Amino acid sequence: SMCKPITGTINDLNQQVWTLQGQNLVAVPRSDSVTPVTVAVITCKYPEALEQGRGDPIYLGIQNPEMCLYCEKVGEQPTLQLKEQKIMDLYGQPEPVKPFLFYRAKTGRTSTLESVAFPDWFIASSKRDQPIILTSELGKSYNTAFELNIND
């Protein structure tokens, strides 16, 4: 059983890698030779409590600094935020903390990442140097299929 998160990097099919610019995750071409952000993933303990058939629910964060991805709902639409949060705190909670959770659905070499709290909103990248965001639009102007370079 998982006793710590698995770490690695994430990129999209246009080979844009996730990086931390200030306080935002941003996708940039690997060619830029920037330092990718180190991502941290851990599976929720209680998948039976969540929807089945949508992928494995995971907590998703970055390291150095330690922050977790979160779907915030202050306005009309949910938006993707980084919160100062210990991933192992989330893992230690006696019930799933839905706004920090994402369904990872694998298809071949890639995974989509869907908000558990806001169904059919997906983590996405788009153009070079744009923030990683949540979108309800699949297939359009947004990349939602990610290569998760972590040792599952």
To the nearest 10°, report the CA torsion of 83, 115, 124, 45: 70
Cα distances (angstroms) measured from residue 94 to each of 45, 67, 89, 104 = 9, 20, 10, 21
- Residue partners of 104: CB distance under 8 A and separation at least 6: 41, 55, 56, 57, 58, 111, 112, 113, 148
- Residue partners of 84: CB distance under 8 A and separation at least 6: 65, 66, 67
**Domain CATH number, residue 1:** 2.80.10.50
Give the domain extent around 68. Answer: 1-152
CB 5 within 8 A of CB 116: no
CA separation for the pair 149, 147 (Å, rounded): 6
Quote the tokens at residue 62: 């970055």
Three-class SS state of 97: coil
Q: How many domains, the chain?
A: 1
CA separation for the pair 90, 143 (Å, rounded): 27
